[PDB]
Coordinates of C-alpha atoms in Angstrom, one line a residue:
Chain B
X486 CA 0.0 0.0 0.0
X487 CA 1.4 3.3 -1.1
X488 CA 4.5 1.5 -2.5
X489 CA 5.0 0.9 -6.2
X490 CA 7.7 -0.2 -8.7
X491 CA 8.6 2.8 -10.8
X492 CA 9.8 1.0 -13.9
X493 CA 7.1 -0.1 -16.4
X494 CA 7.4 -2.1 -19.6
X495 CA 6.2 -0.8 -23.0
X496 CA 3.7 -3.1 -24.5
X497 CA 4.9 -3.9 -28.0
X498 CA 2.9 -5.9 -30.5
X499 CA 2.4 -5.5 -34.3
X500 CA -1.4 -5.2 -33.8
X501 CA -1.1 -2.0 -31.8
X502 CA -2.3 1.3 -33.2
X503 CA 0.1 3.4 -35.2
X504 CA 0.0 6.1 -32.5
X505 CA 1.3 3.8 -29.9
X506 CA 3.7 2.0 -32.2
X507 CA 7.3 2.1 -30.8
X508 CA 9.5 4.8 -32.4
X509 CA 13.3 4.7 -32.2
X510 CA 14.5 8.2 -31.5
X511 CA 18.1 9.5 -31.9
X512 CA 18.7 12.8 -30.2
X513 CA 21.9 14.6 -31.2
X514 CA 23.1 17.2 -28.7
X515 CA 25.2 20.0 -30.3
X516 CA 27.3 21.8 -27.7
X517 CA 30.1 24.3 -28.6
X518 CA 32.6 24.5 -25.7
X519 CA 35.9 26.4 -25.3
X520 CA 37.7 23.4 -26.7
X521 CA 38.8 23.4 -30.4
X522 CA 36.3 22.3 -33.0
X523 CA 36.8 19.1 -35.0
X524 CA 33.6 17.7 -36.5
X525 CA 32.7 19.7 -39.6
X526 CA 30.5 19.3 -42.6
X527 CA 31.4 17.6 -45.9
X528 CA 33.8 18.9 -48.5
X529 CA 33.6 19.8 -52.2
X530 CA 36.9 19.3 -54.1
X531 CA 35.8 20.4 -57.6
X532 CA 37.8 19.9 -60.8
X533 CA 41.2 21.4 -61.3
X534 CA 42.3 23.6 -64.1
Chain J
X20 CA 0.7 14.0 1.8
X21 CA -3.0 14.3 1.2
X22 CA -5.0 11.4 0.0
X23 CA -5.6 13.1 -3.3
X24 CA -1.9 12.7 -4.3
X25 CA -2.1 9.0 -3.3
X26 CA -5.3 8.5 -5.2
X27 CA -4.0 10.0 -8.4
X28 CA -0.9 7.9 -8.1
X29 CA -2.9 4.7 -7.8
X30 CA -4.9 5.8 -10.8
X31 CA -1.9 6.5 -13.0
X32 CA -0.3 3.1 -12.4
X33 CA -3.7 1.4 -12.8
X34 CA -4.2 2.6 -16.4
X35 CA -0.9 1.1 -17.6
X36 CA -1.3 -2.3 -15.9
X37 CA -5.0 -2.5 -16.8
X38 CA -4.3 -1.5 -20.4
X39 CA -1.9 -4.4 -21.0
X40 CA -4.1 -7.1 -19.4
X41 CA -7.3 -5.7 -20.9
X42 CA -5.8 -5.7 -24.4
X43 CA -4.7 -9.3 -24.2
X44 CA -8.1 -10.3 -22.8
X45 CA -9.9 -8.7 -25.7
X46 CA -7.3 -10.0 -28.2
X47 CA -7.9 -13.5 -27.0
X48 CA -11.6 -13.2 -27.6
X49 CA -10.9 -11.9 -31.1
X50 CA -8.9 -15.0 -32.1
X51 CA -11.6 -17.1 -30.6
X52 CA -14.5 -15.5 -32.6
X53 CA -12.6 -15.2 -35.8
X54 CA -11.3 -18.8 -35.5
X55 CA -12.7 -21.7 -33.5
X56 CA -9.9 -23.8 -32.1
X57 CA -8.9 -25.5 -28.9
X58 CA -6.1 -23.0 -28.4
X59 CA -8.3 -19.9 -28.7
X60 CA -11.0 -21.4 -26.4
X61 CA -8.4 -21.8 -23.6
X62 CA -6.7 -18.4 -24.3
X63 CA -10.1 -16.7 -23.8
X64 CA -10.5 -18.3 -20.4
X65 CA -6.9 -17.7 -19.2
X66 CA -6.8 -14.1 -20.5
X67 CA -10.4 -13.5 -19.3
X68 CA -9.7 -14.8 -15.8
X69 CA -6.4 -12.9 -15.6
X70 CA -8.2 -9.6 -16.3
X71 CA -11.2 -10.6 -14.2
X72 CA -9.0 -11.3 -11.2
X73 CA -7.1 -8.1 -11.9
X74 CA -10.0 -5.8 -11.0
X75 CA -10.7 -8.0 -7.9
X76 CA -7.1 -7.4 -6.7
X77 CA -7.2 -3.7 -7.5
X78 CA -10.6 -3.3 -5.8
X79 CA -9.1 -4.3 -2.5
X80 CA -6.7 -1.3 -2.7
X81 CA -9.4 1.0 -4.2
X82 CA -11.6 0.9 -1.1
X83 CA -8.7 2.3 1.0
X84 CA -9.0 5.7 -0.7
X85 CA -12.2 7.4 0.6
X86 CA -13.9 9.8 -1.9
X87 CA -14.7 12.3 0.8
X88 CA -11.2 13.7 0.8
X89 CA -11.0 13.9 -3.0
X90 CA -12.0 17.3 -4.4
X91 CA -11.4 16.3 -8.0
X92 CA -14.4 15.2 -10.1
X93 CA -12.3 13.2 -12.6
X94 CA -10.6 11.4 -9.8
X95 CA -13.7 10.2 -8.0
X96 CA -15.3 9.0 -11.3
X97 CA -12.3 6.7 -11.9
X98 CA -12.4 5.4 -8.4
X99 CA -16.2 5.2 -8.4
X100 CA -16.1 2.0 -10.6
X101 CA -13.1 0.6 -8.7
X102 CA -14.7 1.1 -5.4
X103 CA -17.3 -1.6 -6.3
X104 CA -16.3 -5.1 -5.2
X105 CA -18.5 -6.8 -7.8
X106 CA -19.3 -10.3 -6.5
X107 CA -16.8 -10.1 -3.7
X108 CA -19.5 -8.6 -1.4
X109 CA -21.6 -11.8 -1.9
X110 CA -21.0 -14.9 0.2
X111 CA -18.6 -17.6 -0.9
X112 CA -21.5 -19.8 -1.8
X113 CA -23.7 -17.1 -3.3
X114 CA -20.7 -15.8 -5.2
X115 CA -19.8 -19.2 -6.8
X116 CA -23.5 -20.2 -7.3
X117 CA -24.2 -17.0 -9.2
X118 CA -21.8 -17.9 -12.0
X119 CA -23.4 -21.4 -12.2
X120 CA -26.9 -19.9 -12.6
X121 CA -25.7 -17.5 -15.4
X122 CA -23.9 -20.3 -17.2
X123 CA -26.8 -22.7 -16.7
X124 CA -29.4 -20.2 -18.0
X125 CA -27.2 -19.1 -20.9
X126 CA -26.6 -22.8 -21.9
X127 CA -30.3 -23.7 -22.0
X128 CA -30.9 -20.6 -24.2
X129 CA -28.4 -21.8 -26.8
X130 CA -29.1 -25.5 -26.4
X131 CA -32.9 -25.0 -26.1
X132 CA -35.0 -26.2 -29.0
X133 CA -38.6 -27.1 -29.9
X134 CA -39.2 -30.3 -31.9
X135 CA -41.6 -30.0 -34.8
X136 CA -45.1 -31.2 -33.7
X137 CA -45.7 -32.6 -37.2
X138 CA -42.2 -34.0 -37.5
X139 CA -41.1 -35.3 -34.1
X140 CA -37.8 -36.5 -35.6
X141 CA -36.8 -33.0 -36.8
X142 CA -36.0 -30.7 -33.8
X143 CA -34.9 -27.2 -34.6
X144 CA -33.0 -24.9 -32.2
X145 CA -34.3 -21.4 -31.5
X146 CA -31.5 -19.5 -33.1
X147 CA -31.4 -19.5 -36.1
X148 CA -34.0 -22.3 -36.4
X149 CA -36.9 -20.9 -34.4
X150 CA -36.1 -17.2 -35.1
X151 CA -36.0 -17.6 -38.9
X152 CA -39.2 -19.7 -39.2
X153 CA -41.3 -17.3 -37.1
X154 CA -40.2 -14.4 -39.2
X155 CA -41.9 -15.4 -42.5
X156 CA -44.5 -17.8 -41.0
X157 CA -48.0 -16.6 -41.8
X158 CA -49.7 -19.6 -40.2
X159 CA -51.7 -19.2 -37.0
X160 CA -51.1 -22.8 -35.7
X161 CA -47.5 -23.0 -37.0
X162 CA -46.6 -19.8 -35.2
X163 CA -48.4 -20.9 -32.0
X164 CA -46.7 -24.3 -31.8
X165 CA -43.2 -22.9 -31.7
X166 CA -44.3 -19.9 -29.6
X167 CA -46.3 -21.8 -27.1
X168 CA -44.2 -24.9 -26.8
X169 CA -40.9 -22.9 -26.3
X170 CA -41.8 -21.4 -22.9
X171 CA -43.2 -24.7 -21.8
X172 CA -39.8 -26.5 -21.5
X173 CA -37.9 -23.1 -21.2
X174 CA -40.1 -20.6 -19.4
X175 CA -41.2 -23.3 -16.9
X176 CA -37.8 -24.9 -16.5
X177 CA -36.0 -21.5 -16.2
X178 CA -38.4 -20.4 -13.4
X179 CA -36.4 -22.1 -10.6
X180 CA -33.1 -20.8 -12.1
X181 CA -34.6 -17.3 -12.5
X182 CA -35.7 -17.3 -8.9
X183 CA -32.2 -17.8 -7.7
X184 CA -31.0 -15.1 -10.1
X185 CA -33.4 -12.7 -8.4
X186 CA -32.4 -13.6 -4.8
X187 CA -28.6 -13.8 -5.6
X188 CA -28.4 -10.5 -7.5
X189 CA -30.4 -8.7 -4.7
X190 CA -27.8 -9.7 -2.1
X191 CA -25.2 -7.9 -4.3
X192 CA -27.1 -4.6 -4.5
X193 CA -27.8 -4.6 -0.7
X194 CA -24.1 -5.0 0.0
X195 CA -23.4 -2.1 -2.3
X196 CA -25.9 0.2 -0.3
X197 CA -28.4 0.1 -3.1
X198 CA -32.2 0.0 -2.6
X199 CA -32.4 -3.1 -4.7
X200 CA -31.0 -4.9 -7.8
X201 CA -33.3 -2.8 -10.1
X202 CA -31.6 0.4 -8.9
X203 CA -28.2 -1.2 -9.8
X204 CA -28.8 -0.8 -13.5
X205 CA -30.1 2.7 -13.0
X206 CA -26.8 3.7 -11.5
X207 CA -25.4 4.1 -15.0
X208 CA -27.4 7.3 -15.3
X209 CA -26.5 8.5 -11.8
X210 CA -25.0 12.0 -11.8
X211 CA -23.5 13.6 -8.6
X212 CA -20.8 16.1 -7.8
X213 CA -21.9 18.9 -10.1
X214 CA -24.2 21.6 -8.9
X215 CA -27.5 21.7 -10.8
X216 CA -26.7 18.7 -13.1
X217 CA -27.2 16.1 -10.4
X218 CA -29.4 13.2 -11.6
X219 CA -31.0 10.9 -9.0
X220 CA -31.3 7.1 -9.8
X221 CA -35.0 7.1 -8.9
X222 CA -35.6 9.9 -11.4
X223 CA -35.3 7.4 -14.3
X224 CA -38.5 5.7 -13.4
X225 CA -40.4 9.0 -13.7
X226 CA -38.6 10.1 -16.9
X227 CA -39.2 6.8 -18.8
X228 CA -42.8 6.9 -17.5
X229 CA -43.4 10.5 -18.4
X230 CA -41.9 10.3 -21.9
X231 CA -43.9 7.2 -22.7
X232 CA -47.1 9.1 -22.2
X233 CA -46.4 11.2 -25.3
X234 CA -45.5 8.2 -27.4
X235 CA -49.0 6.7 -26.8
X236 CA -50.8 8.8 -29.5
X237 CA -48.1 7.8 -32.0
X238 CA -48.1 4.1 -31.1
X239 CA -51.9 3.9 -30.8
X240 CA -52.3 5.0 -34.4
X241 CA -49.5 2.7 -35.5
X242 CA -51.1 -0.2 -33.7
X243 CA -54.6 0.4 -35.1
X244 CA -53.1 0.5 -38.7
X245 CA -51.3 -2.8 -38.2
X246 CA -54.5 -4.4 -36.8
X247 CA -56.6 -3.2 -39.8
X248 CA -54.5 -4.9 -42.4
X249 CA -54.3 -8.2 -40.4
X250 CA -58.0 -8.0 -39.4
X251 CA -59.2 -9.7 -42.6
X252 CA -57.2 -12.9 -41.7
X253 CA -58.8 -13.7 -38.4
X254 CA -61.8 -11.4 -37.5
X255 CA -62.9 -13.6 -34.6
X256 CA -59.7 -13.6 -32.6
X257 CA -58.8 -10.0 -33.7
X258 CA -61.2 -7.5 -32.3
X259 CA -61.4 -3.9 -33.6
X260 CA -61.0 -2.4 -30.1
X261 CA -59.0 -5.4 -28.9
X262 CA -55.4 -6.4 -29.1
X263 CA -53.3 -8.3 -31.6
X264 CA -52.1 -11.9 -31.0
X265 CA -48.8 -12.2 -29.2
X266 CA -47.4 -14.7 -31.7
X267 CA -48.3 -12.7 -34.8
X268 CA -45.9 -9.8 -34.0
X269 CA -43.6 -11.2 -36.7
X270 CA -40.9 -12.9 -34.6
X271 CA -40.5 -14.9 -31.4
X272 CA -40.7 -12.1 -28.8
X273 CA -42.3 -9.4 -30.9
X274 CA -39.4 -7.0 -30.4
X275 CA -39.3 -5.6 -33.9
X276 CA -42.2 -5.3 -36.4
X277 CA -40.1 -4.8 -39.4
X278 CA -41.0 -8.4 -40.6
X279 CA -44.6 -7.1 -41.0
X280 CA -43.5 -4.3 -43.4
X281 CA -44.3 -6.6 -46.3
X282 CA -48.0 -6.8 -45.6
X283 CA -48.2 -3.3 -44.1
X284 CA -46.9 -1.5 -47.2
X285 CA -49.3 1.5 -47.7
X286 CA -48.7 1.7 -51.4
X287 CA -47.7 -1.4 -53.4
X288 CA -48.0 0.3 -56.8
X289 CA -44.8 2.3 -56.3
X290 CA -41.2 1.2 -56.2
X291 CA -39.1 1.1 -53.1
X292 CA -35.6 2.3 -52.5
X293 CA -33.2 -0.7 -52.6
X294 CA -29.4 -0.7 -53.2
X295 CA -29.2 -4.5 -53.7
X296 CA -29.8 -4.5 -57.4
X297 CA -27.9 -1.2 -57.8
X298 CA -24.7 -2.5 -56.0
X299 CA -24.8 -5.7 -58.0
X300 CA -24.5 -3.9 -61.3
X301 CA -21.9 -1.6 -59.8
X302 CA -19.9 -4.7 -58.9
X303 CA -18.9 -3.8 -55.4
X304 CA -17.4 -6.1 -52.7
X305 CA -16.8 -5.9 -49.0
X306 CA -13.5 -4.1 -49.5
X307 CA -15.2 -1.1 -51.2
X308 CA -18.2 -1.1 -48.9
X309 CA -16.3 0.1 -45.9
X310 CA -14.1 2.4 -48.0
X311 CA -17.3 4.3 -49.2
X312 CA -18.4 4.7 -45.6
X313 CA -15.0 6.0 -44.5
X314 CA -15.4 9.0 -46.8
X315 CA -18.6 9.8 -45.1
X316 CA -17.0 10.4 -41.7
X317 CA -14.4 12.6 -43.4
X318 CA -17.1 14.8 -44.9
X319 CA -18.3 15.7 -41.4
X320 CA -14.7 16.4 -40.1
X321 CA -14.1 13.1 -38.3
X322 CA -10.7 11.6 -38.8
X323 CA -10.4 8.7 -41.2
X324 CA -9.6 5.0 -40.3
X325 CA -6.1 3.8 -39.5
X326 CA -4.3 1.5 -41.9
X327 CA -4.4 -1.4 -39.5
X328 CA -8.2 -1.0 -39.2
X329 CA -8.9 -1.8 -42.8
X330 CA -6.1 -4.4 -43.1
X331 CA -7.3 -6.5 -40.1
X332 CA -11.0 -6.4 -40.9
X333 CA -12.8 -9.7 -41.5
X334 CA -15.0 -9.5 -44.6
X335 CA -16.4 -13.0 -44.7
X336 CA -16.3 -16.5 -43.2
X337 CA -13.9 -18.8 -45.0
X338 CA -16.1 -21.9 -44.9
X339 CA -16.4 -24.2 -41.9
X340 CA -12.7 -24.8 -41.6
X341 CA -12.2 -21.4 -40.0
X342 CA -15.6 -20.2 -38.7
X343 CA -16.6 -16.9 -37.1
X344 CA -19.8 -15.3 -35.7
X345 CA -21.6 -13.3 -38.4
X346 CA -23.3 -11.2 -35.7
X347 CA -22.1 -7.6 -36.4
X348 CA -20.0 -6.3 -33.5
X349 CA -17.5 -3.5 -33.0
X350 CA -14.6 -4.7 -31.0
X351 CA -12.4 -2.1 -29.2
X352 CA -9.3 -3.7 -27.6
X353 CA -6.8 -0.9 -26.9
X354 CA -3.5 0.7 -27.9
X355 CA -5.2 2.1 -31.0
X356 CA -6.2 -1.4 -32.3
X357 CA -9.7 -1.3 -33.8
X358 CA -11.3 -4.1 -35.7
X359 CA -14.8 -5.3 -36.8
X360 CA -15.9 -8.9 -37.3
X361 CA -18.9 -9.2 -39.6
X362 CA -20.0 -11.4 -42.6
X363 CA -20.3 -9.0 -45.5
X364 CA -22.9 -9.8 -48.2
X365 CA -24.4 -7.6 -50.9
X366 CA -27.6 -6.1 -49.5
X367 CA -29.2 -2.8 -48.7
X368 CA -29.0 -3.6 -44.9
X369 CA -25.3 -4.4 -44.9
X370 CA -24.6 -1.0 -46.3
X371 CA -26.6 0.6 -43.6
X372 CA -25.1 -1.7 -41.0
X373 CA -21.6 -0.8 -42.2
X374 CA -22.1 2.8 -41.1
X375 CA -23.4 1.5 -37.7
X376 CA -20.6 -0.9 -37.1
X377 CA -18.1 1.8 -38.2
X378 CA -19.9 4.3 -35.9
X379 CA -18.8 2.4 -32.9
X380 CA -15.2 2.4 -34.1
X381 CA -15.4 6.1 -35.0
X382 CA -16.9 6.8 -31.6
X383 CA -14.1 5.1 -29.8
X384 CA -11.5 7.3 -31.6
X385 CA -12.6 10.5 -30.0
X386 CA -12.3 9.5 -26.3
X387 CA -9.4 7.2 -27.0
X388 CA -7.1 9.9 -25.4
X389 CA -9.0 9.5 -22.1
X390 CA -7.7 7.2 -19.3
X391 CA -8.6 3.5 -19.4
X392 CA -11.2 3.8 -16.7
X393 CA -12.5 7.0 -18.4
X394 CA -12.9 5.4 -21.8
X395 CA -16.6 4.6 -22.3
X396 CA -19.9 6.1 -23.3
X397 CA -21.7 8.6 -21.0
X398 CA -24.3 5.8 -20.5
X399 CA -25.5 2.5 -21.9
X400 CA -27.7 4.2 -24.6
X401 CA -25.0 6.3 -26.3
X402 CA -23.1 3.2 -27.6
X403 CA -25.7 2.2 -30.2
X404 CA -27.2 5.7 -30.5
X405 CA -24.2 7.3 -32.1
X406 CA -24.2 4.5 -34.7
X407 CA -27.8 4.9 -35.6
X408 CA -27.5 8.6 -36.5
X409 CA -25.0 7.5 -39.1
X410 CA -27.3 4.9 -40.6
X411 CA -30.3 7.2 -40.7
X412 CA -28.2 9.6 -42.8
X413 CA -27.4 6.9 -45.3
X414 CA -31.0 5.7 -45.7
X415 CA -32.0 9.1 -46.9
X416 CA -32.5 9.3 -50.7
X417 CA -30.2 12.3 -50.8
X418 CA -27.2 10.4 -49.6
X419 CA -27.8 7.4 -51.9
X420 CA -28.1 9.6 -55.0
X421 CA -24.8 11.3 -54.0
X422 CA -22.6 8.2 -54.4
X423 CA -24.7 6.9 -57.3
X424 CA -26.6 4.0 -55.8
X425 CA -30.1 5.4 -56.6
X426 CA -30.9 6.8 -60.0
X427 CA -30.8 10.6 -60.2
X428 CA -34.3 10.7 -61.8
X429 CA -35.9 8.7 -59.0
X430 CA -39.1 10.5 -58.0
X431 CA -39.2 11.5 -54.3
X432 CA -42.7 12.4 -53.0
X433 CA -45.1 11.7 -50.2
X434 CA -46.0 8.2 -51.4
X435 CA -42.3 7.4 -51.5
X436 CA -41.4 8.7 -48.1
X437 CA -44.6 7.6 -46.4
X438 CA -43.6 4.0 -47.1
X439 CA -40.1 4.7 -45.8
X440 CA -41.3 6.1 -42.5
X441 CA -43.5 3.1 -41.8
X442 CA -40.5 0.8 -42.2
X443 CA -38.5 2.8 -39.7
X444 CA -41.5 3.2 -37.4
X445 CA -41.9 -0.5 -36.9
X446 CA -38.3 -0.9 -35.9
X447 CA -38.4 2.3 -33.7
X448 CA -42.0 2.7 -32.5
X449 CA -42.3 -1.0 -32.2
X450 CA -39.4 -1.5 -29.8
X451 CA -40.3 1.4 -27.5
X452 CA -43.5 -0.1 -25.9
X453 CA -41.9 -3.6 -25.7
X454 CA -38.8 -2.0 -24.1
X455 CA -40.6 0.0 -21.5
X456 CA -42.9 -2.9 -20.8
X457 CA -40.3 -5.6 -20.2
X458 CA -37.8 -3.2 -18.5
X459 CA -40.5 -1.9 -16.1
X460 CA -41.6 -5.4 -15.2
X461 CA -38.1 -6.4 -14.1
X462 CA -37.9 -3.3 -11.9
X463 CA -41.1 -4.3 -10.2
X464 CA -40.2 -8.0 -9.6
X465 CA -36.7 -7.1 -8.3
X466 CA -38.1 -4.3 -6.1
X467 CA -40.5 -6.8 -4.5
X468 CA -43.8 -5.2 -5.5
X469 CA -45.0 -8.3 -7.4
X470 CA -45.2 -11.6 -5.5
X471 CA -43.7 -14.7 -7.0
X472 CA -47.1 -16.0 -7.9
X473 CA -48.1 -12.8 -9.8
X474 CA -45.1 -12.7 -12.1
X475 CA -47.1 -13.9 -15.0
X476 CA -50.4 -12.4 -13.8
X477 CA -48.8 -9.0 -13.9
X478 CA -46.8 -9.7 -17.1
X479 CA -49.8 -10.0 -19.4
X480 CA -51.9 -7.7 -17.4
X481 CA -49.4 -4.9 -18.0
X482 CA -48.8 -6.1 -21.6
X483 CA -52.2 -5.3 -23.0
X484 CA -52.1 -1.9 -21.3
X485 CA -48.6 -1.0 -22.6
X486 CA -48.1 -2.8 -25.9
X487 CA -51.7 -4.0 -26.3
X488 CA -50.9 -7.7 -26.8
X489 CA -52.9 -10.6 -25.4
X490 CA -51.9 -14.2 -24.9
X491 CA -53.7 -16.8 -27.0
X492 CA -53.1 -19.5 -24.4
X493 CA -53.3 -18.4 -20.7
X494 CA -50.3 -19.1 -18.6
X495 CA -49.8 -19.6 -14.9
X496 CA -46.9 -18.4 -12.7
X497 CA -44.8 -21.4 -13.7
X498 CA -43.9 -19.9 -17.1
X499 CA -41.3 -17.1 -17.3
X500 CA -41.5 -14.9 -20.4
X501 CA -38.3 -12.9 -19.8
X502 CA -36.4 -16.1 -19.1
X503 CA -36.3 -16.9 -22.8
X504 CA -35.2 -13.5 -23.9
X505 CA -31.6 -13.1 -24.9
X506 CA -30.8 -10.0 -22.7
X507 CA -32.8 -11.2 -19.7
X508 CA -31.0 -14.6 -19.6
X509 CA -27.6 -13.1 -20.3
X510 CA -27.8 -10.5 -17.5
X511 CA -27.6 -7.5 -19.9
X512 CA -29.2 -4.1 -19.6
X513 CA -32.6 -4.0 -21.3
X514 CA -33.2 -0.3 -20.6
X515 CA -30.4 0.9 -22.9
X516 CA -32.6 0.2 -26.0
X517 CA -35.4 2.5 -24.8
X518 CA -33.2 5.6 -24.2
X519 CA -31.4 4.9 -27.5
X520 CA -34.5 6.0 -29.4
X521 CA -34.8 9.3 -27.6
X522 CA -31.0 10.0 -27.8
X523 CA -30.6 9.2 -31.5
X524 CA -33.5 11.5 -32.5
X525 CA -32.3 14.4 -30.3
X526 CA -28.9 14.3 -32.1
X527 CA -30.6 14.0 -35.5
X528 CA -32.6 17.2 -34.8
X529 CA -29.6 19.1 -33.3
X530 CA -27.0 18.0 -35.9
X531 CA -29.4 19.1 -38.8
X532 CA -29.8 22.6 -37.2
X533 CA -26.0 23.1 -37.5
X534 CA -25.9 21.9 -41.1
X535 CA -28.7 24.4 -41.9
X536 CA -31.0 21.8 -43.7
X537 CA -34.6 22.7 -44.4
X538 CA -37.7 20.6 -44.8
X539 CA -38.7 17.4 -43.0
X540 CA -36.3 15.7 -40.7
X541 CA -36.1 12.4 -42.6
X542 CA -34.9 14.5 -45.6
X543 CA -31.9 15.8 -43.7
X544 CA -28.5 14.5 -44.7
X545 CA -25.3 15.3 -42.7
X546 CA -23.0 14.5 -45.6
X547 CA -20.8 17.2 -47.0
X548 CA -21.6 19.3 -43.9
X549 CA -18.5 19.9 -41.8
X550 CA -20.3 22.1 -39.2
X551 CA -22.3 19.3 -37.6
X552 CA -19.3 17.1 -37.1
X553 CA -17.4 19.7 -35.1
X554 CA -20.3 20.0 -32.7
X555 CA -20.7 16.2 -32.2
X556 CA -16.9 15.7 -31.9
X557 CA -16.8 17.6 -28.7
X558 CA -19.0 15.1 -26.9
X559 CA -17.5 12.1 -28.7
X560 CA -14.1 12.7 -27.0
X561 CA -15.7 13.3 -23.5
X562 CA -17.1 9.8 -23.0
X563 CA -18.2 9.1 -19.4
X564 CA -15.5 11.4 -17.9
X565 CA -18.2 14.0 -17.6
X566 CA -21.9 13.7 -16.5
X567 CA -24.1 12.6 -19.5
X568 CA -26.5 15.4 -18.5
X569 CA -23.8 18.0 -19.1
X570 CA -22.4 16.5 -22.3
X571 CA -26.0 16.2 -23.7
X572 CA -26.5 20.0 -23.2
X573 CA -23.5 20.8 -25.5
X574 CA -25.2 18.9 -28.3
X575 CA -29.0 19.2 -28.2
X576 CA -29.0 21.8 -25.4
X577 CA -31.3 19.7 -23.2
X578 CA -30.6 18.6 -19.6
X579 CA -32.7 15.4 -19.9
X580 CA -34.6 13.2 -22.4
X581 CA -37.4 14.7 -24.5
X582 CA -39.9 13.2 -26.9
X583 CA -40.2 16.3 -29.0
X584 CA -37.8 15.0 -31.7
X585 CA -39.8 11.8 -31.8
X586 CA -42.9 13.6 -32.8
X587 CA -41.3 15.8 -35.5
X588 CA -39.4 13.0 -37.3
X589 CA -42.5 10.8 -37.2
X590 CA -44.8 13.8 -37.8
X591 CA -45.4 13.2 -41.5
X592 CA -46.4 9.6 -40.7
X593 CA -48.6 10.6 -37.8
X594 CA -50.6 13.0 -40.0
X595 CA -51.2 10.2 -42.6
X596 CA -52.0 7.5 -40.1
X597 CA -54.6 9.7 -38.3
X598 CA -56.6 9.9 -41.5
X599 CA -56.4 6.2 -42.3
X600 CA -57.6 5.4 -38.8
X601 CA -60.7 7.5 -39.0
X602 CA -62.8 4.5 -40.1
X603 CA -61.3 2.4 -37.3
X604 CA -61.0 2.9 -33.5
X605 CA -57.7 4.5 -32.3
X606 CA -56.4 2.6 -29.3
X607 CA -57.2 -0.8 -27.7
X608 CA -58.9 -2.2 -24.6
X609 CA -57.5 -4.4 -21.9
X610 CA -60.8 -6.2 -21.2
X611 CA -60.7 -8.3 -24.5
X612 CA -59.1 -11.7 -24.7
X613 CA -59.0 -14.3 -27.5
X614 CA -60.1 -17.2 -25.2
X615 CA -62.6 -15.0 -23.3
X616 CA -65.9 -14.3 -25.1

């Protein structure tokens, strides 16, 4: 009484509605600190003349 | 610290644990109905008992949170159902013996049969056997043999089993602090906690009795017209001021008079609206039948159906290898899983039934966002009422001509609509008297006002006064008429059918005022009108989380039931029947009997 288990399991079955269907989420956290920058976007490297 | 925080915590963890077990319990019943196998029959019992025992385990912890310290209305409503112990309040013997009576009475109903008097070898069961023969049977003796002989081995044998059902169920209501078992069913309409919207349980007896008084002038004319057409067959047994035989109602229990529409057709020289021959030429199947109905809900603003809904539907019965019940039903399991199990043929009724079966699913989508305990209709009459308003819109010639079923040159006039109102009146006006008659009798027997010996004496005595029906063969207190009925033997609410007629008509009159349609009510069509859908969607998502009296005000603007929409929609028919009954006597007398001369 007044004591419960906090963790609960997500019911997953293919017959469940699309709204409750499990969705795998990937969250990218972009943080710019005082340290030098490394990761950058792609390159171009066009033709040479 | 306060009990409110503890109550809300118990309610949050209850919806999750109950949603998983409830979904598996309903899913087990689906595989059992769609396919009959030894694995599905056991899964339904295991999954059914696991969920049945779940509420019994949660009910013990629900009674530890009194509702006096809870100031939230939505919180007390969730705990209001959990506070009930169900059969736990009954004694160990009375609790276990109750299920034996329900299973014994339900078994005799399905296994009950009446052997053919002329063919003792052939013995046909009631359903379908006895229900189909009595529909088209025009014989006086043929209908009396199956009608009289059924209650002999059923009504008489079920009397001792029904007596225990009355004493056992009463012990449950008394333990719940209810006046009697009859008040138990009236609790569905109970409304408390909101100032001015409170609805007492005892007020239902006065509302159903007060609204029935206004239906008498409409039913009396409808009864006199039906007795005039059938008066030529048996003038001796059928009196002009008397009552019609009980076995001639068109079926076993005389619930619906639609079967008599054939001989009651006012005009036989004019065609009738039927989509059977039109759909055949169009070459439509069960796949496109539901698709055409899905576009109807979108025209009013209601969301469409999910992909899984149409993919998991069952459109027919693949032979006897895998068999399913063709009885149309809308199954709502959970987690956004909606399905419908029905056998789909090509007929004008299946098209109308498609909108009804889909209405239940469409209705479950609005309140699906509510908690598990808060997912439900405001009462027992709103379940099938929301689905009837959808079918009534499809039966209108305007909706049929829109999709192309009915020819655009079809002439629509009084002669055409008068025949349509009569068909709907028998299914509507016919069930009302029978519903108020049987439902009121159960309330009197359970309340203790009718001694055990007067059960049958008061049954037919109140039948001629309400529905105006007399028994060809007099019966003693041994027979039990309700014992044979499906809802009475299965312990289901029989009052929900009476209120469904008043609720479906109120929405029909209110929804048509939003769409700005002019003319008679039966000419109204809600298709292509997005204004009426937005007004009905508000109450659709509320469910039972709010008092039905309050939710009903946001639609029709009424705080209770009213018969006014019943007179207007049937007004054109009442004006015509009043003239045809001038040569006859409107009404019936209770002093006439077929065996008393």
